[PDB]
Amino acid sequence: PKIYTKTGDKGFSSTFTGERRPKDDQVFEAVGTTDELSSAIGFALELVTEKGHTFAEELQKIQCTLQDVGSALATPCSSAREAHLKYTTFKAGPILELEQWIDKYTSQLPPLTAFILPSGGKISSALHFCRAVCCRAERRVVPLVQMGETDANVAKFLNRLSDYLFTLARYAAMKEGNQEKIYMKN
Amino acid sequence: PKIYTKTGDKGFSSTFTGERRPKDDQVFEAVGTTDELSSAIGFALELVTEKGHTFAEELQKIQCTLQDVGSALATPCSSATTFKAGPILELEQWIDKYTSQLPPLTAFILPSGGKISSALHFCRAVCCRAERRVVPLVQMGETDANVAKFLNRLSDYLFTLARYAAMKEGNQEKIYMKNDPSAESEG
Amino acid sequence: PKIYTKTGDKGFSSTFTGERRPKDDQVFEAVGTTDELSSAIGFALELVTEKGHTFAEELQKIQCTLQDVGSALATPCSSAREAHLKYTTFKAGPILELEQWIDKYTSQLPPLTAFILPSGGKISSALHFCRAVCCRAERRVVPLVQMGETDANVAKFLNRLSDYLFTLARYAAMKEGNQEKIYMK
Ligand SMILES: Nc1ncnc2c1ncn2[C@@H]1O[C@H](COP(=O)(O)OP(=O)(O)OP(=O)(O)O)[C@@H](O)[C@H]1O
Ligand SMILES: Nc1ncnc2c1ncn2[C@@H]1O[C@H](COP(=O)(O)OP(=O)(O)OP(=O)(O)O)[C@@H](O)[C@H]1O
Ligand SMILES: Nc1ncnc2c1ncn2[C@@H]1O[C@H](COP(=O)(O)OP(=O)(O)OP(=O)(O)O)[C@@H](O)[C@H]1O
Ligand SMILES: [K+]
Ligand SMILES: [K+]
Ligand SMILES: [K+]
Ligand SMILES: [K+]
Ligand SMILES: [K+]
Ligand SMILES: [K+]
Ligand SMILES: [Mg+2]
Ligand SMILES: [Mg+2]
Ligand SMILES: [Mg+2]
Ligand SMILES: [Mg+2]
């Protein structure tokens, strides 16, 4: 069977529960923005792997969890059978692991005091962009959690992930020798 | 007449029909996201040309069609458009060509496979976002249905091209593996 | 302190004026998309500095002004008090400077066309992506201007910045001796 089924050609698509919705539904905005984040991370990962940083494995693990995020988002509670809710439950384990990684890098960084510019070299800049896309994904998940469609832990993970990406960007810039850019109005 | 006319400085702009709409109108959201997609493809194209891949001209032709998509979107029928299906069938022929050079997809791949493949997966995700912005305009009857079908087919092409580029470069794509640091998974 | 306060874990966040609003509120969509634009420019900047182009300094100054844009957006006029005027005020100066920079490059470039594809080399193509994200940021700020939440000059600056990014992309392509790709039917 060809990759193009054409069943999505008139603007509808399927969730994991089998429910079909218009493609501009909040579910597909959330699934799609999570995929956009994972794709941005995938490009940043290519810059890590080539430039000799060592945290590539952490970003790959995050992409795996982002697939679990996408699967949970694609399983709205309002149309989920018993057997589907195995995919709606998003366990909190990965959130705790992000906190442990944030702690690990924070020990090696200078104190964060003021706002910094998104900068610090190619990899740090890419990770700041990933961070911004992650914040956008969070904004897309918030209404689904408010409507009872999605486990609150999905949004908690994305909230914590933007802190991880911020911290990893600062870590990468420090390892490259690039000092943080601080600007204050006036 | 400089490039900055300032006619957009109060938050309104003009469609191709000359109609004034606020810049957050669904028309400009669709036009803008199609332009974002074309721009992402343009950056991927730069990486493709550096590596010497064969499909640089296909991506350039796609950018041309995306300008036609933007033109159609900027011409709502309510204030008027004809997007032919030709480009959709050409995408299908290209997908078929690359699919014939690849194994069937068995594993769930992550966005990965090299700098070029990963850039194409990002273009794929932006293309899906463009599709979501065009769907309400088609459903309202403002835009030719073929515009949404082209964007639907294009994310399939970008996915297939990413896989094809990784194969030609000899790069290992990453596959999904369950991440369960707290041993909470049941099955 | 841990950077993760978890006060955002239930879908709400803070404005600079002390409001709590849901994270999908238009204020955070605008703040977030301006941050996305600044981060995209930061990546473009790294490509520019690898070639030692002096206009890296213009891109870094723009990142600073985008921080001021974000601060203004995060300080909605509906809840601002007297001391918040330091952040709600957005003067016309940065807009006029973009126009001067646009004029500077335009006098060195071939006549303007509306039929170039996003192209012209890695730097030029990256700047065309930044331009598209800039237009998206502008779309997120215009409803806040309409609601009286944000200074009109904030949207004017983002409008002008798209034109600057377009012009700088053309200028980078020319300096590299790169032919831009042209639309064909
Ligand atoms: N534009 C989109 N944005 C976000 N999510 C999407 C979009 N299109 C589809 N999806 C989701 O991603 C899944 C796979 O996408 P796919 O393109 O195979 O589906 P489709 O567009 O419905 O069908 P087809 O492309 O074969 O016509 C869908 O089942 C749906 O859950
Ligand atoms: N922020 C935006 N997002 C998406 N599309 C836009 C945006 N602004 C304008 N457009 C569309 O793109 C076309 C060209 O944009 P341009 O920036 O020249 O228009 P403007 O902002 O209305 O005018 P000016 O920038 O000269 O004040 C416009 O005619 C309109 O159709
Ligand atoms: N997802 C988002 N999109 C856009 N802007 C955001 C988002 N989350 C927070 N903000 C804004 O950015 C500021 C800093 O974000 P931060 O992540 O520290 O806040 P939070 O998410 O509310 O708290 P925490 O992350 O500690 O639980 C916030 O005060 C808010 O103004
Ligand atoms: K498909
Ligand atoms: K968006
Ligand atoms: K203009
Ligand atoms: K969009
Ligand atoms: K935080
Ligand atoms: K690069
Ligand atoms: Mg947060
Ligand atoms: Mg223009
Ligand atoms: Mg599809
Ligand atoms: Mg404009």
Numbering used by the authors:
A (entry chain A): 56 to 241
B (entry chain E): 56 to 135, 143 to 249
C (entry chain D): 56 to 240
Q: What did the published study say regarding this structure?
A:
Human ATP:cob(I)alamin adenosyltransferase (ATR) is a mitochondrial enzyme that catalyzes an adenosyl transfer to cob(I)alamin, synthesizing 5′-deoxyadenosylcobalamin (AdoCbl) or coenzyme B12. ATR is also a chaperone that escorts AdoCbl, transferring it to methylmalonyl-CoA mutase, which is important in propionate metabolism. Mutations in ATR lead to methylmalonic aciduria type B, an inborn error of B12 metabolism. Human ATR is a homotrimer with active sites that are located at the subunit interfaces.
The structure of R190C ATR·ATP represents the highest resolution structure reported so far for human ATR. An alignment of these two structures showed that the R190C mutation did not elicit a major structural change in the protein (Cα RMSD = 0.5). All six monomers in the asymmetric unit were identical and ATP could be modeled with an occupancy of one per monomer. In this structure, a complete ordering of loops, except for the first 50 residues, was observed. ATP induced ordering of residues 68 to 80 into a β-hairpin, forming the roof of the active site. An overlay of the ATP binding sites shows that many of the interactions that stabilize ATP binding are retained in the R190C ATR. Although the overall mode of ATP binding is unperturbed, the R190C mutation leads to the loss of multidentate electrostatic interactions between Arg-190 and ATP, possibly contributing to the higher KM(ATP) value and in turn, the higher KD values for cob(II)alamin (in the presence of ATP) and AdoCbl (±PPPi). Interestingly, the salt bridge between Arg-190 and the ribose oxygen is replaced by a hydrogen bond between Cys-190 and the ribose oxygen mediated via a bridging water. The salt bridges between Arg-190 and the α-phosphate oxygens are however, lost. The position of the C5′ carbon, which is attacked by cob(I)alamin, is unchanged in the crystal structure of the R190C mutant.
